[PDB]
C-alpha cells in the first residue's frame, strides 16, 4: 500500500491521457480486442434492434506506465481507474 | 463516519444484473472503527437476471 501509493504517485506525476501512449509518434498503438457475450437480452424484430450484454476486453501497452518491481517492494501488478 | 468515496472500497458488484447497472444506489458513508475495521451498508435497487 505504501509501496503502491508511492508507485501510483510516481507514474501519474507528469502523465498525459491526451496523447497516445507511445514513446515515438510514428509508433502504432496495438490493441487486442476480444468480445465476450454474457447474455442475449432481446431481439426486437419491429425496430430491428438486438440487445446483448457483453464484456469488451481490450489489451494494449502503455510505454509511459512501466516500473521496476524491485524499486517498489516487488509490486508487479496494480488496479487503477480507467 | 466517513463518506465512502474518501476511503478505498472493494469493487463488489452484482455480476448477474439484467439492466447493466452493477453498483449500489447510494454511496452513503462507511463506519470506521479505531482498529481499522470498516463497515459499509449501502442501499441497492437491483434487477438481476433470473
Amino acid at each position: 500500500s505504501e509501496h503502491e501509493t508511492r508507485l501510483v504517485a510516481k507514474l501519474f506525476k507528469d502523465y498525459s491521457s491526451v496523447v497516445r501512449p507511445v514513446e515515438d509518434h510514428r509508433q502504432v498503438v496495438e490493441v487486442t480486442v476480444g468480445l465476450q457475450l454474457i447474455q442475449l437480452i432481446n431481439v426486437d424484430e419491429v425496430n430491428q434492434i438486438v440487445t446483448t450484454n457483453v464484456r469488451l476486453k481490450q489489451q494494449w501497452v502503455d510505454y509511459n506506465l512501466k516500473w521496476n518491481p524491485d524499486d517498489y517492494g516487488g509490486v508487479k501488478k496494480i488496479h487503477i481507474p480507467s | 463516519r466517513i463518506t465512502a468515496e474518501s476511503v478505498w472500497l472493494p469493487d463488489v458488484v452484482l455480476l448477474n444484473n439484467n439492466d447493466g447497472n452493477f453498483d449500489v444506489a447510494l454511496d452513503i458513508s462507511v463506519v470506521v472503527s479505531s482498529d481499522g475495521s470498516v463497515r459499509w451498508q449501502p442501499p441497492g435497487i437491483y434487477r438481476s437476471s433470473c
Binding site: S1, T5, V8, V75 | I2, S6, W8, L9
Partner: peptide, 28 residues
Amino acid sequence: SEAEGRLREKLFSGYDSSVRPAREVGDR
C-alpha cells in the same frame, strides 16, 4: 468536532483511496 477534524486530517494524509490496503505484497 475539532478533535474529529484533527483525526480526519491525520488519517487522510498520504492516503490514496485507489490503492488497495496491503501492508506487504501478497496480503489479501
